[PDB]
Protein backbone atom coordinates (compact mmCIF):
# COMPACT_ATOMS: atom_id res chain seq x y z
CA UNK A 1 0.00 0.00 0.00
CA UNK A 2 1.22 3.51 -1.10
CA UNK A 3 0.13 7.13 -0.50
CA UNK A 4 1.49 9.98 -2.64
CA UNK A 5 1.92 13.45 -1.10
CA UNK A 6 2.99 16.72 -2.76
CA UNK A 7 4.63 19.28 -0.48
CA UNK A 8 6.48 22.60 -0.97
CA UNK A 9 10.01 23.34 0.55
CA UNK A 10 8.84 23.88 4.16
CA UNK A 11 12.12 22.77 5.92
CA UNK A 12 15.89 22.63 5.03
CA UNK A 13 15.64 19.03 3.63
CA UNK A 14 11.98 18.98 2.69
CA UNK A 15 11.60 15.31 1.56
CA UNK A 16 13.85 13.81 4.33
CA UNK A 17 12.07 15.83 7.09
CA UNK A 18 8.62 14.85 5.76
CA UNK A 19 9.69 11.17 5.53
CA UNK A 20 10.97 11.35 9.16
CA UNK A 21 7.62 13.07 10.22
CA UNK A 22 5.50 10.24 8.69
CA UNK A 23 7.76 7.21 9.67
CA UNK A 24 5.58 6.46 12.81
CA UNK A 25 2.47 6.51 10.55
CA UNK A 26 4.20 4.23 7.97
CA UNK A 27 5.05 1.67 10.77
CA UNK A 28 1.60 1.79 12.44
CA UNK A 29 -0.36 1.30 9.13
CA UNK A 30 2.19 -0.87 7.16
CA UNK A 31 2.28 1.71 4.26
CA UNK A 32 4.81 3.71 2.23
CA UNK A 33 4.28 7.51 1.88
CA UNK A 34 6.04 8.70 -1.31
CA UNK A 35 6.66 12.50 -1.26
CA UNK A 36 7.44 14.92 -4.16
CA UNK A 37 8.67 18.47 -3.39
CA UNK A 38 7.30 21.29 -5.65
CA UNK A 39 8.96 24.74 -5.68
CA UNK A 40 6.46 27.46 -4.66
CA UNK A 41 7.12 29.06 -8.07
CA UNK A 42 5.69 26.04 -9.94
CA UNK A 43 3.23 24.57 -7.30
CA UNK A 44 0.10 26.44 -8.58
CA UNK A 45 0.69 25.19 -12.20
CA UNK A 46 1.39 21.58 -11.03
CA UNK A 47 -1.56 21.53 -8.62
CA UNK A 48 -4.14 23.09 -11.06
CA UNK A 49 -2.85 20.68 -13.80
CA UNK A 50 -3.45 17.73 -11.42
CA UNK A 51 -6.90 19.22 -10.67
CA UNK A 52 -8.14 19.55 -14.28
CA UNK A 53 -6.30 16.38 -15.60
CA UNK A 54 -7.08 13.87 -12.79
CA UNK A 55 -3.36 12.89 -12.65
CA UNK A 56 -1.85 13.59 -9.27
CA UNK A 57 -1.12 12.53 -5.69
CA UNK A 58 -3.57 11.43 -2.94
CA UNK A 59 -2.71 14.55 -0.83
CA UNK A 60 -1.26 17.95 -1.78
CA UNK A 61 -0.05 20.80 0.36
CA UNK A 62 -2.14 23.89 -0.53
CA UNK A 63 -1.28 27.39 0.50
CA UNK A 64 -4.14 28.82 2.62
CA UNK A 65 -4.76 31.50 -0.08
CA UNK A 66 -5.34 28.76 -2.73
CA UNK A 67 -7.87 26.57 -0.87
CA UNK A 68 -10.88 28.54 -2.18
CA UNK A 69 -9.72 28.43 -5.82
CA UNK A 70 -8.93 24.67 -5.87
CA UNK A 71 -12.07 23.84 -3.84
CA UNK A 72 -14.22 25.79 -6.42
CA UNK A 73 -12.97 23.42 -9.22
CA UNK A 74 -14.88 20.64 -7.35
CA UNK A 75 -11.81 18.29 -7.18
CA UNK A 76 -11.31 18.00 -3.36
CA UNK A 77 -12.74 15.37 -1.00
CA UNK A 78 -14.86 16.73 1.95
CA UNK A 79 -12.74 16.44 5.18
CA UNK A 80 -15.36 17.69 7.79
CA UNK A 81 -14.96 14.17 9.37
CA UNK A 82 -11.15 14.69 9.83
CA UNK A 83 -11.71 18.24 11.25
CA UNK A 84 -14.35 16.88 13.73
CA UNK A 85 -11.87 14.17 14.83
CA UNK A 86 -9.20 16.93 15.36
CA UNK A 87 -11.53 18.93 17.72
CA UNK A 88 -13.72 20.87 15.19
CA UNK A 89 -14.06 24.69 14.95
CA UNK A 90 -12.85 25.35 18.53
CA UNK A 91 -9.51 23.55 17.91
CA UNK A 92 -8.44 26.42 15.50
CA UNK A 93 -8.01 30.22 15.41
CA UNK A 94 -11.05 31.51 13.42
CA UNK A 95 -8.59 32.95 10.77
CA UNK A 96 -7.27 29.33 10.35
CA UNK A 97 -10.79 27.80 10.35
CA UNK A 98 -11.86 30.04 7.46
CA UNK A 99 -9.00 28.45 5.29
CA UNK A 100 -10.58 24.91 5.57
CA UNK A 101 -13.15 25.81 2.84
CA UNK A 102 -14.20 28.04 -0.07
CA UNK A 103 -16.03 31.06 1.55
CA UNK A 104 -19.75 30.14 1.69
CA UNK A 105 -19.20 26.40 0.85
CA UNK A 106 -21.15 23.55 2.49
CA UNK A 107 -18.23 21.13 3.27
CA UNK A 108 -14.60 21.66 4.40
CA UNK A 109 -11.99 20.70 1.72
CA UNK A 110 -8.68 21.32 3.54
CA UNK A 111 -7.02 20.28 6.86
CA UNK A 112 -4.86 22.97 8.55
CA UNK A 113 -1.17 21.88 8.54
CA UNK A 114 0.98 24.92 9.60
CA UNK A 115 0.54 28.66 10.11
CA UNK A 116 3.03 31.48 9.35
CA UNK A 117 2.93 35.28 9.55
CA UNK A 118 5.30 38.09 8.58
CA UNK A 119 7.59 40.24 10.74
CA UNK A 120 10.92 42.09 10.34
CA UNK A 121 14.26 40.39 10.87
CA UNK A 122 16.88 42.97 11.81
CA UNK A 123 20.62 43.04 12.42
CA UNK A 124 21.03 43.75 16.16
CA UNK A 125 24.68 44.85 15.61
CA UNK A 126 23.72 47.21 12.74
CA UNK A 127 20.77 48.91 14.58
CA UNK A 128 22.95 49.40 17.72
CA UNK A 129 25.73 50.95 15.53
CA UNK A 130 23.19 53.25 13.81
CA UNK A 131 21.73 54.41 17.16
CA UNK A 132 18.30 52.85 16.37
CA UNK A 133 16.10 51.50 19.21
CA UNK A 134 14.10 48.71 17.51
CA UNK A 135 11.18 49.45 19.94
CA UNK A 136 10.93 52.96 18.33
CA UNK A 137 11.73 51.89 14.71
CA UNK A 138 9.03 49.16 14.57
CA UNK A 139 6.24 51.01 16.47
CA UNK A 140 5.00 53.34 13.71
CA UNK A 141 5.43 54.24 10.02
CA UNK A 142 7.14 57.46 11.17
CA UNK A 143 9.52 55.51 13.47
CA UNK A 144 10.17 53.05 10.61
CA UNK A 145 11.22 55.75 8.12
CA UNK A 146 13.24 57.56 10.88
CA UNK A 147 15.15 54.35 11.69
CA UNK A 148 15.83 53.64 7.97
CA UNK A 149 17.25 57.24 7.73
CA UNK A 150 19.60 56.46 10.70
CA UNK A 151 20.64 53.10 9.09
CA UNK A 152 21.37 55.00 5.82
CA UNK A 153 23.61 57.49 7.73
CA UNK A 154 25.39 54.70 9.70
CA UNK A 155 29.17 54.14 9.37
CA UNK A 156 28.60 50.42 10.31
CA UNK A 157 30.26 47.84 7.98
CA UNK A 158 29.64 44.05 8.19
CA UNK A 159 32.65 42.32 9.82
CA UNK A 160 32.72 39.63 7.04
CA UNK A 161 31.75 41.60 3.88
CA UNK A 162 33.74 44.74 5.03
CA UNK A 163 30.93 46.66 3.23
CA UNK A 164 28.02 48.89 4.38
CA UNK A 165 24.55 47.28 4.76
CA UNK A 166 21.43 48.40 2.88
CA UNK A 167 18.89 49.83 5.37
CA UNK A 168 16.00 47.71 3.92
CA UNK A 169 15.99 44.77 1.54
CA UNK A 170 12.75 44.14 -0.35
CA UNK A 171 12.44 42.55 -3.83
CA UNK A 172 11.47 44.74 -6.80
CA UNK A 173 11.13 41.96 -9.44
CA UNK A 174 7.50 41.16 -10.38
CA UNK A 175 6.36 39.70 -7.04
CA UNK A 176 4.59 36.31 -7.02
CA UNK A 177 2.30 37.54 -4.16
CA UNK A 178 1.01 40.65 -2.35
CA UNK A 179 2.47 39.26 0.97
CA UNK A 180 5.10 42.10 1.12
CA UNK A 181 2.65 44.90 0.11
CA UNK A 182 -0.47 43.79 2.10
CA UNK A 183 0.55 45.08 5.57
CA UNK A 184 1.17 48.61 4.08
CA UNK A 185 -2.23 48.52 2.25
CA UNK A 186 -3.89 47.36 5.51
CA UNK A 187 -2.00 49.77 7.85
CA UNK A 188 -3.25 52.75 5.76
CA UNK A 189 -6.88 51.43 6.25
CA UNK A 190 -6.97 49.86 2.72
CA UNK A 191 -7.91 46.38 1.40
CA UNK A 192 -7.07 44.27 -1.70
CA UNK A 193 -10.75 43.40 -2.27
CA UNK A 194 -13.97 44.61 -0.54
CA UNK A 195 -17.46 42.99 -0.43
CA UNK A 196 -20.36 45.44 -1.01
CA UNK A 197 -23.88 43.87 -1.05
CA UNK A 198 -22.42 40.32 -1.44
CA UNK A 199 -20.17 41.16 -4.52
CA UNK A 200 -16.33 41.35 -4.28
CA UNK A 201 -14.48 44.30 -5.95
CA UNK A 202 -10.80 45.50 -6.03
CA UNK A 203 -10.01 48.18 -3.40
CA UNK A 204 -6.35 48.46 -4.58
CA UNK A 205 -7.27 51.89 -6.09
CA UNK A 206 -9.02 53.27 -2.92
CA UNK A 207 -7.29 56.39 -1.47
CA UNK A 208 -6.22 54.31 1.62
CA UNK A 209 -4.71 51.39 -0.39
CA UNK A 210 -2.86 53.93 -2.58
CA UNK A 211 -1.52 55.76 0.53
CA UNK A 212 -0.09 52.49 1.93
CA UNK A 213 1.31 51.24 -1.39
CA UNK A 214 2.88 54.64 -2.13
CA UNK A 215 4.41 54.80 1.41
CA UNK A 216 6.04 51.37 0.93
CA UNK A 217 7.23 51.75 -2.72
CA UNK A 218 8.54 55.31 -2.03
CA UNK A 219 10.91 53.94 0.72
CA UNK A 220 12.96 52.47 -2.18
CA UNK A 221 12.68 55.71 -4.25
CA UNK A 222 13.97 57.64 -1.15
CA UNK A 223 17.16 55.49 -1.29
CA UNK A 224 16.50 53.05 1.67
CA UNK A 225 16.43 50.05 -0.73
CA UNK A 226 19.46 49.82 -3.08
CA UNK A 227 18.98 49.70 -6.94
CA UNK A 228 20.37 46.08 -7.02
CA UNK A 229 17.46 44.90 -4.73
CA UNK A 230 14.75 46.04 -7.20
CA UNK A 231 16.32 43.60 -9.79
CA UNK A 232 15.99 40.70 -7.25
CA UNK A 233 13.23 38.33 -6.13
CA UNK A 234 12.44 37.00 -2.60
CA UNK A 235 14.99 34.11 -2.72
CA UNK A 236 17.83 36.51 -3.77
CA UNK A 237 16.86 39.13 -1.10
CA UNK A 238 16.82 36.38 1.59
CA UNK A 239 20.31 35.27 0.50
CA UNK A 240 21.46 38.98 0.60
CA UNK A 241 20.19 39.34 4.24
CA UNK A 242 21.93 36.05 5.23
CA UNK A 243 25.18 37.16 3.46
CA UNK A 244 25.23 40.40 5.58
CA UNK A 245 24.15 42.95 2.91
CA UNK A 246 20.84 44.23 4.53
CA UNK A 247 19.98 45.56 8.02
CA UNK A 248 16.19 44.82 7.87
CA UNK A 249 14.11 42.23 5.94
CA UNK A 250 10.45 41.05 6.25
CA UNK A 251 9.91 37.23 6.25
CA UNK A 252 8.18 34.36 8.10
CA UNK A 253 9.25 32.48 11.27
CA UNK A 254 11.09 29.78 9.25
CA UNK A 255 14.19 31.97 9.08
CA UNK A 256 14.67 31.60 12.91
CA UNK A 257 15.03 27.82 12.32
CA UNK A 258 17.33 28.32 9.27
CA UNK A 259 19.56 30.63 11.45
CA UNK A 260 20.22 27.60 13.79
CA UNK A 261 21.10 25.18 10.87
CA UNK A 262 24.61 24.93 9.35
CA UNK A 263 25.10 26.13 5.71
CA UNK A 264 26.00 22.43 5.02
CA UNK A 265 22.33 21.53 5.82
CA UNK A 266 20.74 24.56 3.96
CA UNK A 267 20.82 27.02 6.94
CA UNK A 268 22.99 30.12 7.63
CA UNK A 269 24.17 29.53 11.25
CA UNK A 270 27.85 30.41 10.45
CA UNK A 271 26.87 33.92 9.10
CA UNK A 272 27.17 37.17 11.14
CA UNK A 273 23.38 37.78 10.47
CA UNK A 274 22.51 34.47 12.30
CA UNK A 275 24.60 35.58 15.36
CA UNK A 276 23.16 39.17 15.41
CA UNK A 277 19.55 38.29 14.64
CA UNK A 278 16.51 40.21 15.91
CA UNK A 279 12.78 40.13 15.13
CA UNK A 280 10.26 42.97 15.40
CA UNK A 281 6.62 43.29 14.24
CA UNK A 282 5.47 45.42 11.29
CA UNK A 283 5.01 49.01 12.46
CA UNK A 284 1.46 50.37 13.11
CA UNK A 285 0.17 52.44 10.16
CA UNK A 286 -2.25 55.36 10.52
CA UNK A 287 -5.31 52.99 10.68
CA UNK A 288 -3.63 50.31 12.83
CA UNK A 289 -1.25 47.37 12.95
CA UNK A 290 -1.58 44.42 10.54
CA UNK A 291 0.62 41.68 9.14
CA UNK A 292 0.05 38.93 6.55
CA UNK A 293 -1.09 35.67 8.30
CA UNK A 294 -1.08 32.50 6.15
CA UNK A 295 0.33 28.98 6.15
CA UNK A 296 -0.58 25.74 4.34
CA UNK A 297 -3.30 23.09 4.53
CA UNK A 298 -3.50 19.51 3.19
CA UNK A 299 -6.21 18.46 0.73
CA UNK A 300 -7.24 15.06 -0.68
CA UNK A 301 -8.03 14.81 -4.44
CA UNK A 302 -11.50 13.25 -4.99
CA UNK A 303 -9.84 11.02 -7.68
CA UNK A 304 -7.61 9.37 -5.00
CA UNK A 305 -7.96 5.54 -4.83
CA UNK A 306 -6.86 5.54 -1.11
CA UNK A 307 -9.34 7.94 0.59
CA UNK A 308 -9.73 6.12 3.95
CA UNK A 309 -5.93 5.73 4.42
CA UNK A 310 -5.33 9.31 3.14
CA UNK A 311 -7.78 10.65 5.76
CA UNK A 312 -5.95 8.68 8.50
CA UNK A 313 -2.76 10.52 7.32
CA UNK A 314 -4.65 13.88 7.41
CA UNK A 315 -5.69 13.10 11.04
CA UNK A 316 -2.07 12.19 11.90
CA UNK A 317 -0.51 15.29 10.25
CA UNK A 318 -3.26 17.54 11.73
CA UNK A 319 -2.96 16.10 15.32
CA UNK A 320 -0.92 17.33 18.30
CA UNK A 321 2.23 15.08 17.95
CA UNK A 322 2.87 15.72 14.20
CA UNK A 323 1.71 19.40 14.58
CA UNK A 324 4.44 20.14 17.18
CA UNK A 325 7.11 17.99 15.45
CA UNK A 326 6.62 19.52 11.96
CA UNK A 327 6.56 23.11 13.33
CA UNK A 328 9.90 22.26 15.03
CA UNK A 329 11.38 20.86 11.78
CA UNK A 330 10.15 23.79 9.60
CA UNK A 331 10.33 26.87 11.87
CA UNK A 332 6.58 27.38 11.07
CA UNK A 333 3.87 27.60 13.79
CA UNK A 334 1.31 24.82 14.33
CA UNK A 335 -2.06 25.19 12.61
CA UNK A 336 -3.69 23.49 15.68
CA UNK A 337 -4.29 26.21 18.33
CA UNK A 338 -3.53 23.90 21.34
CA UNK A 339 -0.01 23.13 19.93
CA UNK A 340 0.90 26.94 20.14
CA UNK A 341 1.08 26.53 23.92
CA UNK A 342 3.89 23.88 23.61
CA UNK A 343 6.84 25.38 25.59
CA UNK A 344 9.26 24.72 22.68
CA UNK A 345 7.53 27.69 20.82
CA UNK A 346 7.50 30.07 23.87
CA UNK A 347 11.27 29.58 24.69
CA UNK A 348 12.78 31.14 21.44
CA UNK A 349 12.58 34.87 22.17
CA UNK A 350 12.45 35.51 18.36
CA UNK A 351 9.58 33.06 17.82
CA UNK A 352 7.73 34.64 20.82
CA UNK A 353 7.75 37.90 18.80
CA UNK A 354 6.02 36.13 15.85
CA UNK A 355 3.47 34.63 18.29
CA UNK A 356 2.67 38.08 19.79
CA UNK A 357 2.48 39.54 16.21
CA UNK A 358 -0.34 37.02 15.43
CA UNK A 359 -2.68 39.30 17.46
CA UNK A 360 -2.51 41.64 14.37
CA UNK A 361 -2.52 38.81 11.79
CA UNK A 362 -4.80 39.32 8.79
CA UNK A 363 -5.77 36.87 6.05
CA UNK A 364 -7.07 37.14 2.49
CA UNK A 365 -10.73 36.08 1.97
CA UNK A 366 -11.08 32.41 0.73
CA UNK A 367 -12.35 33.35 -2.82
CA UNK A 368 -12.85 31.07 -5.89
CA UNK A 369 -11.09 33.78 -7.95
CA UNK A 370 -8.13 34.39 -5.55
CA UNK A 371 -5.42 32.93 -7.86
CA UNK A 372 -6.43 35.28 -10.71
CA UNK A 373 -6.91 38.27 -8.33
CA UNK A 374 -3.36 37.97 -6.85
CA UNK A 375 -1.79 37.21 -10.30
CA UNK A 376 -3.44 40.33 -11.78
CA UNK A 377 -2.47 42.47 -8.76
CA UNK A 378 1.21 41.46 -8.82
CA UNK A 379 1.56 42.02 -12.62
CA UNK A 380 0.51 45.69 -12.14
CA UNK A 381 2.50 46.04 -8.86
CA UNK A 382 5.56 44.71 -10.87
CA UNK A 383 5.18 47.72 -13.20
CA UNK A 384 4.98 50.15 -10.23
CA UNK A 385 8.34 48.65 -9.00
CA UNK A 386 9.69 49.27 -12.55
CA UNK A 387 8.78 53.00 -12.14
CA UNK A 388 10.38 53.02 -8.65
CA UNK A 389 13.66 51.70 -10.20
CA UNK A 390 13.63 54.69 -12.61
CA UNK A 391 12.67 57.25 -9.89
CA UNK A 392 9.35 57.86 -11.73
CA UNK A 393 6.72 56.47 -9.29
CA UNK A 394 4.30 59.39 -8.61
CA UNK A 395 0.97 59.09 -6.73
CA UNK A 396 -0.73 59.69 -10.14
CA UNK A 397 1.22 56.90 -11.97
CA UNK A 398 0.53 54.46 -9.05
CA UNK A 399 -3.22 55.39 -9.19
CA UNK A 400 -3.20 54.76 -13.02
CA UNK A 401 -1.60 51.31 -12.47
CA UNK A 402 -4.02 50.39 -9.64
CA UNK A 403 -7.07 51.59 -11.67
CA UNK A 404 -5.94 49.13 -14.44
CA UNK A 405 -5.32 46.38 -11.83
CA UNK A 406 -8.83 47.09 -10.39
CA UNK A 407 -10.54 46.88 -13.79
CA UNK A 408 -8.76 43.52 -14.47
CA UNK A 409 -9.58 42.15 -10.99
CA UNK A 410 -13.29 43.27 -11.12
CA UNK A 411 -13.59 41.66 -14.60
CA UNK A 412 -12.11 38.33 -13.25
CA UNK A 413 -14.38 38.43 -10.11
CA UNK A 414 -17.55 38.92 -12.27
CA UNK A 415 -16.64 35.43 -13.82
CA UNK A 416 -17.71 33.83 -10.46
O1 LIG B 1 1.15 32.29 -2.06
C1 LIG B 1 0.95 30.92 -1.78
C2 LIG B 1 1.17 30.71 -0.29
O2 LIG B 1 2.34 31.34 0.14
C3 LIG B 1 2.66 30.93 1.48
O3 LIG B 1 3.93 31.50 1.79
C4 LIG B 1 5.09 30.82 1.36
C5 LIG B 1 5.75 31.61 0.21
O4 LIG B 1 4.91 31.51 -0.95
C6 LIG B 1 7.10 30.99 -0.16
O5 LIG B 1 7.71 31.68 -1.28
C7 LIG B 1 7.98 30.86 1.08
O6 LIG B 1 9.09 30.04 0.71
C8 LIG B 1 10.19 29.91 1.60
C9 LIG B 1 10.20 28.50 2.16
O7 LIG B 1 9.07 28.33 2.99
C10 LIG B 1 11.44 28.26 3.00
O8 LIG B 1 11.60 26.91 3.43
C11 LIG B 1 12.70 28.73 2.27
O9 LIG B 1 13.74 28.79 3.23
C12 LIG B 1 15.09 28.42 2.89
C13 LIG B 1 15.03 27.00 2.28
O10 LIG B 1 15.12 26.03 3.33
C14 LIG B 1 16.11 26.77 1.25
O11 LIG B 1 15.84 25.55 0.57
C15 LIG B 1 16.05 27.96 0.31
O12 LIG B 1 16.80 27.66 -0.86
O13 LIG B 1 16.59 29.10 1.00
C16 LIG B 1 15.80 29.57 2.11
C17 LIG B 1 16.72 30.48 2.98
O14 LIG B 1 16.43 30.44 4.39
O15 LIG B 1 12.51 30.08 1.86
C18 LIG B 1 11.51 30.14 0.86
C19 LIG B 1 11.71 31.46 0.10
O16 LIG B 1 11.09 32.49 0.84
O17 LIG B 1 7.27 30.10 2.09
C20 LIG B 1 6.04 30.68 2.53
C21 LIG B 1 5.49 29.85 3.70
O18 LIG B 1 5.10 28.54 3.31
C22 LIG B 1 1.63 31.38 2.52
O19 LIG B 1 2.05 30.90 3.82
C23 LIG B 1 0.27 30.90 2.08
O20 LIG B 1 -0.74 31.46 2.90
C24 LIG B 1 0.03 31.25 0.60
O21 LIG B 1 -1.11 30.61 0.13
O1 LIG C 1 7.86 60.64 -1.20
S1 LIG C 1 7.31 61.94 -1.69
O2 LIG C 1 7.14 61.70 -3.15
O3 LIG C 1 5.92 61.93 -1.15
CL1 LIG D 1 6.04 44.11 -3.20
CL1 LIG E 1 -7.79 42.35 1.71
TrEMBL record:
Swiss-Prot/TrEMBL keywords: Plasmid, Signal, Transport
Q: List the disulfide bonds.
A: 169-246
MF annotations from Gene Ontology:
maltose binding
What Pfam families does its record include?
SBP_bac_8 (PF13416)
On whether Signal is a keyword of this UniProt record, the answer is yes
What are the GO BP annotations of this UniProt entry?
A: maltodextrin transmembrane transport; maltose transport
- Gene Ontology CC annotations of this record: ATP-binding cassette (ABC) transporter complex, substrate-binding subunit-containing
Q: Write down the SUPFAM superfamilies for this protein, in alphabetical order.
A: Periplasmic binding protein-like II
Q: Which InterPro entries does the entry link to?
A: SBP
What the record says about family reads: Belongs to the bacterial solute-binding protein 1 family.
Q: What is this protein called?
A: Sugar ABC transporter, periplasmic sugar-binding protein
Taxonomic source organism: Thermus thermophilus (strain ATCC 27634 / DSM 579 / HB8)
Amino acid sequence: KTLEVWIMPNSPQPAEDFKALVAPFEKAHGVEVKVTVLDWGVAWTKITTAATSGVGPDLTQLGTTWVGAISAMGVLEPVDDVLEALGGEKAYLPAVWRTTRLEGARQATAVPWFSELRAFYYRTDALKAAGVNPAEMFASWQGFEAGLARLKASSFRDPETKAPLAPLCTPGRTPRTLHNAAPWIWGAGGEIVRQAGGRWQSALNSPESLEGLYFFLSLAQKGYVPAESLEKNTAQIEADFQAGKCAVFASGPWMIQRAQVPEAKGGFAERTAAKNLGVAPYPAGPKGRYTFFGGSNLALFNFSKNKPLAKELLKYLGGPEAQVRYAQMTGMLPALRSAWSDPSFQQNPLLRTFIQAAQFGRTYPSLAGWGGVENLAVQHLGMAWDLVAQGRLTREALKDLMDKASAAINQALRHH
